[PDB]
Amino acid sequence: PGFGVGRGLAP
Amino acid sequence: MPPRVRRRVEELLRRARELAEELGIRVEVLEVDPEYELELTAVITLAILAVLAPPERQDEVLELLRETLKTLSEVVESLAVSIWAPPEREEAARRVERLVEEAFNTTPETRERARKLRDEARRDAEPDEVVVAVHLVPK
Numbered sequence A: 001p002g003f004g005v006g007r008g009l010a011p
Numbered sequence B: 001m002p003p004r005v006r007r008r009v010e011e012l013l014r015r016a017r018e019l020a021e022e023l024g025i026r027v028e029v030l031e032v033d034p035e036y037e038l039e040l041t042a043v044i045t046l047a048i049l050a051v052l053a054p055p056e057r058q059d060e061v062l063e064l065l066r067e068t069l070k071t072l073s074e075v076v077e078s079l080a081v082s083i084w085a086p087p088e089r090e091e092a093a094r095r096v097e098r099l100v101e102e103a104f105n106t107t108p109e110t111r112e113r114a115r116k117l118r119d120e121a122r123r124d125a126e127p128d129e130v131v132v133a134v135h136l137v138p139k
Helices: B003-023 B034-052 B055-072 B087-103 B108-122
Strands: A003-009 B026-032 B076-084 B130-138
Touching (some): A003 B108, B003 B055, B026 B034, B034 B076, B087 B130
Antiparallel strands (some): A003 B130, B076 B130
């Protein structure tokens, strides 16, 4: 799809 | 695709994962087309790290993301980035969006197709998590 997702959390 | 591009992106990603743990920031690439894993992973990790890094450490990450985007500009015709960020880290997310638009003019359609995948991950994300969705079209 050419798509990608990710997420992140701070300390 | 060019092995040179892979080597540089893999290197920029390895610096990105170094800085993330130096700062204690956790990135989880939820989903990615395996045909473009390294590309998406590097943009997603750097874009996330740049929103979450301390303001004094953000230029080094933003510098890394600029280098990544310039290299990907050889294998990527257009790139779109959609970010949701906590209130205290909104301007940081704006600097990432400005950097991507400077490198690849975002354009409305692929910007909204990414916001949809972003919103799909937002349904499961935590209220204080940064969510980055990326769309690319290969050269």
